[PDB]
Design a protein around this ligand. Structure first.
Ligand code: SF4
Length: 83
């Protein structure tokens, strides 16, 4: 079950970025964002994931202030975690 502040499918920014909490139900292949082959991309290996926000599988994303994403999710702003 998602936290009360999870990013949800109806959030305008989530729609614009084609976020999904489950990267296997995402369009990461179509987007072909650079840095890793697409099938390898999810929030856990994204630069915008905030490992010190949230709990468990539900972590922060700098693009979704006040909310939580799933570490197993994806959106079209995915960017390799470089530091
Ligand atoms: S920017 Fe990165 S951490 Fe945030 S939802 Fe998109 S893929 Fe996940």
């Amino acid at each position: 079950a998602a936290p009360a502040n999870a990013v949800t499918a109806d959030d305008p920014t989530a729609i614009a970025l084609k976020y999904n909490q489950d990267a296997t139900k995402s369009e990461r292949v179509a987007a072909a964002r650079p840095g890793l082959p697409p099938e390898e991309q999810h929030c856990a290996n994204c630069q915008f994931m905030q490992a010190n926000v949230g709990e468990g599988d539900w972590k922060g994303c700098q693009l979704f202030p006040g909310k939580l994403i799933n570490v197993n999710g994806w959106c079209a702003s995915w960017t390799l975690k470089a530091g």
